[PDB]
Amino acid sequence: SSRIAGDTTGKYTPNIFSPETPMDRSFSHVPKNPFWEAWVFRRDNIQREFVWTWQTIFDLATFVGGLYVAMYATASFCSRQNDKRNGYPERNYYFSDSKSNFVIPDEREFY
Amino acid sequence: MSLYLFMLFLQPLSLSFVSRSFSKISSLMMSFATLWSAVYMWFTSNGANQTFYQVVSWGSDWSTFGVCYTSLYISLLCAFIFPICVILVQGYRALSILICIQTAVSLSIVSLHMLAFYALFESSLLLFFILIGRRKYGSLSAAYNISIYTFISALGFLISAFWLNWSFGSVCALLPNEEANSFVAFGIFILLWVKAPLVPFHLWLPEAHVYAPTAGSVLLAGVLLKISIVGLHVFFLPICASSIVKAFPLILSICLGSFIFSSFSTLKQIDLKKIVAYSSISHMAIVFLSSATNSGLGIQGAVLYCIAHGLISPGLFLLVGILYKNTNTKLVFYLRGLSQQAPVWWSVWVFFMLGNLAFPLFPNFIAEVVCLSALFKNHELYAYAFIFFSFVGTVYSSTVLGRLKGGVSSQCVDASRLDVISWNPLVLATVVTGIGYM
Amino acid sequence: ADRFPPPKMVATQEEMDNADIPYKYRDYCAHLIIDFKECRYGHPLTWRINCAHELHHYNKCSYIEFKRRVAIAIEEKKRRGLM
Amino acid sequence: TTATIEERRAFHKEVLDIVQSKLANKNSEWARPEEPILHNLKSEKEEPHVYYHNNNFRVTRQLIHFEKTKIFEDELDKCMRTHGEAKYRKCQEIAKRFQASCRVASNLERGPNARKRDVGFIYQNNKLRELEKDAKELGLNNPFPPSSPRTTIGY
Amino acid sequence: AGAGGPVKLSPPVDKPLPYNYDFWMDNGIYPGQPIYDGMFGSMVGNMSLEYMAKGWLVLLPILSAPFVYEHCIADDVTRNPFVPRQYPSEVREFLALFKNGFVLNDYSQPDYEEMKRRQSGLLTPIY
Amino acid sequence: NYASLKADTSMDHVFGDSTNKLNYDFQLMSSKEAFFWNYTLYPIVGFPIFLYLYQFNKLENFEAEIAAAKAAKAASE
Amino acid sequence: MFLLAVYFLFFSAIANGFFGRYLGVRGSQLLGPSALFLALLCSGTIFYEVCIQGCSTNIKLFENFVYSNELNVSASFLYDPLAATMTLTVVWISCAVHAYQNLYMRGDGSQTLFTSYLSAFTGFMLILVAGQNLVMLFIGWEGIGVCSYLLIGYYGSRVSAVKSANKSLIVNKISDGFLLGSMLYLWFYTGSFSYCSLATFQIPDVVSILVLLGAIGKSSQLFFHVWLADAMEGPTPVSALIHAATLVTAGIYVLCKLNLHSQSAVGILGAATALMGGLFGLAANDLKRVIAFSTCSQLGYMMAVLSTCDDGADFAMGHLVSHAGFKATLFLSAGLSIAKENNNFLNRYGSRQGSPTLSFATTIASLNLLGFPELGGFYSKESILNNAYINQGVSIILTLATFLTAFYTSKVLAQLYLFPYGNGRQQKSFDIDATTLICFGLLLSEMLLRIFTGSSLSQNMTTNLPAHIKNLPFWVALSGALSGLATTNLFSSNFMRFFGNRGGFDVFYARKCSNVFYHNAYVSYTLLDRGFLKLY
Ligand SMILES: CCCCCCCCCCCCCCCCCC(=O)O[C@@H](COC(=O)CCCCCCCCCCCCCCC)COP(=O)(O)OCC[N+](C)(C)C
Ligand SMILES: CCCCCCCCCCCCCCCCCC(=O)O[C@@H](COC(=O)CCCCCCCCCCCCCCC)COP(=O)(O)OCC[N+](C)(C)C
Ligand SMILES: CCCCCCCCCCCCCCCCCCCC(=O)O[C@H](COC(=O)CCCCCCCCCCCCCC)COP(=O)(O)OCCN
Ligand SMILES: CCCCCCCCCCCCCCCCCCCC(=O)O[C@H](COC(=O)CCCCCCCCCCCCCC)COP(=O)(O)OCCN
Ligand SMILES: CCCCCCCCCCCCCCCCCCCC(=O)O[C@H](COC(=O)CCCCCCCCCCCCCC)COP(=O)(O)OCCN
Ligand SMILES: CCCCCCCCCCCCCCCCCCCC(=O)O[C@H](COC(=O)CCCCCCCCCCCCCC)COP(=O)(O)OCCN
């Protein structure tokens, strides 16, 4: 019911007319399950079940936007500390409103 | 340099004159010859010439090509990984598409003109639209995603290049120009934001990797993500440093958010290629942030970590492609007992997964140490944030390994002689870089 | 502290360095710990039986120093009025 | 300090003369300069020839600094391994010099966002000294520790 | 016999799978398990988290009672009946440098205040 | 083609039947509970951040108070 | 000469794990133990040269392992007195375990791969111990972590074993993340990664907390002890190595190598860990789990002693090296008992005719655990207890921990030997060859030599304490032993249930931390990138 397809000698021919099923690469293919396939389809196409609810907005804001806000605040604090550490004047960052034009330290200058 | 460019132009040229039955053999020989030409370019690149090792121009500002530290590493990496892509791909159509893509990408790395960089890099726009949207195994949605994302980001970059060419009169890197404008800085930045997958512009990469062929995935992960750092070191940092220092808190916000949310999204994956593709996105953020510090440590660490990624992620993608050939499945839940059924494949899979988790005997360790040191030079908290959330990667990698490792299976799915030949160079390069020959 | 003055330091700095005595062990007992150290490392496995005189002398001097410490504690505590 | 356009063009001409003088004789160490081109330009990018030359000079200097720091570390390790339990006293000077070399190498080209590298905790120690002086003279109570004689093996 | 022991095979899925079925780890042998034991399903010993919290509430005061007395109620003068180890001046000055040293508690010393402020050092680097 | 959906009952008598099922609903934590536990654990993760914030605020406040006392001393004198 | 031992172990690993097809099961059963025997001779030479004769050596294999700008690190080995002692102990225990695995793992399919894992496992421990700079230590640290991951999950067809390996990996990942943070701090403000220039007299608290958090991972302390109990899923030779020397001791070795710890934190954490480990070992009914909880308690003692005195680091190391021996013996004898009885539960063990050597080794190791006078464990434990009297809070908790330790140790001894036979009437047998006898002879020789040579220089130095204070630990241990022999009830059923659940540290993680982790994953993926940002 089966036969060896591969030939190391190089005399390989595919027996498409052979009564016996070749032991080709498809021999070892996984059989698969109907419900697992539908679970895969459901999980990939989870945007179909997306619904805007106040709970969904709450979750998205509190975790994603919350983490962005926390990271931005921490980065701003670190920049302020580094400016105090280095001796630089308060730097004009994009959303900080500063009446100083200091952006890039002059290498030649001693701070 | 000239030999490398000539060979890069020769590879697509040869396909027109080959017999169409000798195409695979000729393409493999051409790829190895290009690798040797890249080694020659490294030989003729003297470290005494500190700014640029080599510069060649062929009659115009657009035809100005040159190699620096970043360019030389990335070009050697692409020339190293291309032959593996060549052997993995069958058919004159596929060979033609992949050769044209590689020629365009490799010409982009050494280009010193922003407009020529744009012209060469986006020439491979339809080729991926056709490649990822191939008849039976491709998805049109992913091709649309990648094509549209690239088009919008590259058009913004092009507008910034036009403004620079109008104001300065030149857009070549070798001519020193500085600008403080934020619109032009954002125009150059948006390309980097999209090409290096950074949240929320990372959605194109997953769909592309899953529905691209194994050679296509290998090239995409290996060098097309690294094109962002060539653009950053060559075309953004020299001119747009004032804007990166002005926006550094925002840059850190976006980078660390990309790291964290990409790590969390990786946990929800059931497809092996998607797991590797999301690991790539989390890995890109450290590179982008380390370069953005504009320090000696950051640039070197970013280019090193790019080399480490371009040696580790192609191996994982290649192993997954081999397993999919053997099993016709990519779902982790279908795949069990791989340790007993495929000991040789399992050994290399575990080795590369350890590499992706940045264990000491792997290049990712050295690269990560340098990048974290640069972040620590900026601030302690910056490094601490990245170091902690690295544990999320361990969770999903360990869960995947545990799911694959054991169980009951009735199929021997182990790699053949061709497959082992395919990954041997990557394993050797990984070891050699891991012991410190970065 | 003043009432109970420090004892004379027999061991000198060059001797303590030559015996490789850590700074924690340089506590007015260092000469005796030099003796004990040299004899202990002289006898790797019989030091428990052979090296008992040196250990005894070190423990004796340490006991005296501990009594001095307790005396200092009592003097300071009575000065503060706690007793 | 103001630069008129005439002076700027004159310096441009003089830099062209410098480039012509360098071009006359071949030099294999052209990109490893031993001396910088002195200038009073607002931005070094204004004159491209000065920019690249001084950038190469800075690179050479930093490479030398890195190798020098490795040397200093080697003698510090040898001196530590030689003396034994007397290391803290006898290796104070060599550690001092090694840490000074580390700070030079790091701080000269730290970058736009990078902070100063505090090897040996010298800047913190100075800050504590200033704080203690001000608190004592003004009658305030300092919530911070007083300055330390030695905080590391050297500095 | 360690090798060759009989095993039960888990039944194949025959019903629509829940969306979060990735929380279940099944290798094909019958007793599948949650990804983290105790996240759902049977509880070891039939003990909930509330029970464990109440038990810890009972334990913590008794466990913390020895530590709270010495650390908080006691003071350096009254902690122990003796002063810290007395050293020669050259040794004592070096040993007093260590923030994690044991000679910083010598209340007999005239540098006690500075030594105590050294012990309660900086939380983070200033620079 | 597809794998068989029929189970094997050979070992049920040895190792028990598969009749008993899980009681889990395969649903996640409630949004309200998740908010509390994220906003509790994440600060615990970021313990260095609060230490740096505390010390920086202490340093700046002491510096400002020194400056104020210096102004007072340099005004009269 | 100093390099040779690491070469021998890594050669055993490569030979057995890559060419084991040619060598065979017998080929492993020779090349493993022979190579580790040669490494034992080399380690003995190292111990004599460095410890006894005070001659430290530095071997730089190559320079610029990482050379990026100022950041420069080299692959160098410094054998200082701490390193020689840990190397000798580790190689001795690993040679014993390799002798043990020849007969124990014969019924296992991949005995060659197991031997290869064991030898690389030892090699990475020696890399950690002998490193001259922080990066070599990190290399060894991660190597032992990955080797533990590949050894605990050796039985891949068991969901429990692979989940235990995942648990170990994740917890250790968090710990080394904290260590990497501390490493970066120390490089930035000291100028180097080498321990010589690493010295700082004053260090900010953040570095100390990061070091402690990294150390409490491998040296399983409280809130980080979950993995040790689950590590029982692996084969018995793995458990002996991980609990005796390689994994648990590494945190203590790091804390002793760099004295950046704070007295207040270490003492409280150690005393709490010792008490909790003893209480957990009270409830346990597997033979192997009780010994792991005892390992936790001993780690708590060692961590606590650092707070007491300046000699605390020496006392901790002495207890470390003493503990490795009798703990390794306890695991090996327990594993042989399981094989002979085909059982893991203490109830069904009982008196049965056996080998005199194994029963004696079990008795002597348990006596060392209890604190029986004039034994190697006794001295190393009284050095801690007597010197902890100054810290009143620590001393009390350690004395109650001694009581609990005595109780469960005596209970285990009575259940294994004194109790009547409890297993069924079936043919069960494990005949022991001469190789296992050589293994237990090596352990017994280590135990005997520990008495004559000692553990610390200040072991017999006087602690000026009243006699009733000094001899108190013996009375507490004796009372615990007598109560354990009678098998009396010490706690109510509620507290016994609480201790059986190990304090519910894992159930809290399950119900809150893991659910929040996967809800964050749900928000990140389903709601956002495959939700809000996905087209119809
Ligand atoms: C399917 C696979 C089957 C085959 C298995 C192969 C087995 C491989 C054997 C493992 C090799 C272990 C050797 C590790 C040392 C690395 C070798 C090395 O790097 O060569 C060094 C020379 O150094 C040596 O030769 C080391 C001697 C090796 C033998 C020492 C004892 C062996 C014990 C192993 C302990 C090594 C721990 C090192 C941790 C990093 C090059 O010298 P440099 O000229 O200075 O090169 C510059 C440095 N850098 C590479 C960073 C650019
Ligand atoms: C430091 C200088 C010297 C370096 C020497 C390192 C020691 C040996 C290094 C050999 C290469 C390391 C990577 C080997 C491949 C990784 C995969 C592996 O180790 O094991 C494979 C297969 O193993 C192999 O075939 C090759 C292993 C040969 C020797 C491995 C030694 C242990 C690896 C060292 C850890 C690497 C360190 C990386 C971090 C520093 C899978 O094993 P399991 O998942 O447990 O399943 C096996 C089946 N069973 C269920 C029955 C257990
Ligand atoms: C619609 C979308 C948005 C809706 C939902 C948003 C809800 C989120 C709001 C809370 C977010 C967390 C709190 C951060 C913002 C606090 C308020 C901002 C103002 C601020 O900067 O104060 C600083 C907060 O401390 C800090 O520097 C940050 C401390 C908190 C960060 C650490 C806690 C989480 C740790 C997890 C890791 C994340 C960070 C990783 C680096 C301290 O004031 P100042 O002294 O700096 O002076 C600066 C003068 N205002
Ligand atoms: C002064 C002006 C004021 C502002 C006015 C704004 C007016 C709107 C401007 C929007 C311009 C953006 C253009 C992109 C449109 C989204 C793509 C179209 C959606 C779509 O259905 O395309 C399908 C697939 O596309 C896909 O699968 C791609 C998915 C979505 C692509 C992601 C967008 C790129 C990234 C967005 C931001 C990038 C950075 C921005 C700086 C193919 O449709 P079909 O071929 O079957 O035709 C059948 C017709 N139904
Ligand atoms: C909301 C968070 C910000 C999201 C960005 C996250 C991080 C991106 C940073 C990229 C780094 C370089 C980019 C330069 C600046 C880009 C955005 C910086 C933030 C920003 O919007 O600042 C604005 C200034 O920039 C501007 O005025 C121009 C903004 C960019 C324009 C957007 C599209 C431009 C496309 C142009 C194509 C190429 C054109 C070339 C001619 C307003 O801040 P402010 O200073 O006014 O302070 C007032 C506060 N009270
Ligand atoms: C020796 C040094 C210290 C060792 C560790 C000591 C830990 C002590 C913490 C526990 C003591 C205080 C507990 C808070 C008081 C709660 C008392 C009632 C508990 C309760 O009603 O709700 C519980 C909340 O979980 C909780 O109570 C979780 C609160 C725990 C705070 C986090 C501290 C780490 C705890 C790790 C070990 C402790 C394990 C037991 C907590 C169960 O919740 P539910 O599942 O029924 O909710 C329903 C699901 N919708």
Side-chain angles (χ1 to χ4, degrees), chain B residues 118-278:
Chain B
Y118 165 92
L120 295 153
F121 162 69
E122 184 178 1
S123 290
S124 66
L125 208 56
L126 282 72
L127 294 170
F128 293 99
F129 182 75
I130 301 299
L131 183 63
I132 309 170
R134 82 203 153 278
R135 192 205 302 206
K136 294 181 176 67
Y137 314 120
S139 179
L140 277 296
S141 296
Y144 265 111
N145 290 318
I146 185 176
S147 307
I148 297 169
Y149 264 97
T150 307
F151 186 81
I152 192 156
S153 56
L155 183 62
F157 171 89
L158 184 72
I159 297 299
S160 288
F162 291 167
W163 194 86
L164 291 180
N165 189 359
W166 172 69
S167 60
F168 191 58
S170 179
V171 72
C172 198
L174 294 174
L175 289 195
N177 184 24
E178 55 158 25
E179 61 86 20
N181 189 359
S182 66
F183 292 90
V184 184
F186 194 70
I188 319 182
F189 191 78
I190 193 66
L191 182 60
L192 295 175
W193 200 343
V194 173
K195 299 290 94 176
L198 183 63
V199 165
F201 300 131
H202 69 295
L203 277 296
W204 61 276
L205 189 82
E207 290 299 85
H209 291 171
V210 159
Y211 288 102
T214 313
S217 289
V218 164
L219 294 174
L220 294 174
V223 298
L224 282 72
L225 293 199
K226 280 73 176 175
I227 301 299
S228 179
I229 294 282
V230 176
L232 183 62
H233 295 157
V234 183
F235 304 118
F236 186 86
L237 283 179
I239 62 170
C240 295
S242 179
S243 296
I244 193 66
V245 65
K246 291 177 71 68
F248 204 70
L250 293 151
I251 296 311
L252 188 153
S253 296
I254 75 182
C255 287
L256 183 63
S258 183
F259 179 70
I260 297 173
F261 298 144
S262 297
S263 289
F264 276 120
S265 313
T266 301
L267 283 158
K268 298 298 293 295
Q269 290 327 296
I270 58 168
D271 186 74
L272 260 181
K273 291 177 70 68
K274 262 165 164 265
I275 294 151
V276 182
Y278 291 169

Side-chain angles (χ1 to χ4, degrees), chain A residues 1-110:
Chain A
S1 179
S2 296
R3 54 147 177 116
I4 309 174
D7 213 330
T8 53
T9 58
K11 293 157 35 53
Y12 159 78
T13 72
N15 291 319
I16 192 66
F17 309 118
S18 66
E20 293 179 353
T21 300
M23 284 156 108
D24 63 358
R25 179 71 275 172
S26 296
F27 202 53
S28 52
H29 282 185
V30 177
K32 301 215 155 149
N33 195 284
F35 303 103
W36 276 108
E37 284 322 281
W39 183 68
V40 173
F41 192 88
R42 188 199 171 156
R43 184 176 177 87
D44 292 359
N45 308 109
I46 206 57
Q47 76 259 5
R48 296 291 185 269
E49 307 171 358
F50 183 73
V51 175
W52 277 114
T53 75
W54 276 119
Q55 168 195 236
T56 300
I57 308 195
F58 174 78
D59 299 325
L60 275 171
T62 52
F63 170 66
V64 171
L67 183 62
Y68 291 166
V69 169
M71 293 182 286
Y72 183 66
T74 311
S76 303
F77 153 72
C78 298
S79 302
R80 172 177 335 111
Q81 194 166 19
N82 286 325
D83 298 351
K84 298 298 293 295
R85 282 162 160 184
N86 283 330
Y88 294 160
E90 76 287 19
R91 298 209 218 181
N92 184 233
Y93 294 106
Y94 267 126
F95 288 116
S96 66
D97 282 351
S98 293
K99 64 182 181 293
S100 179
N101 55 320
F102 193 82
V103 170
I104 286 174
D106 191 28
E107 293 83 4
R108 292 188 296 272
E109 193 74 62
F110 288 75

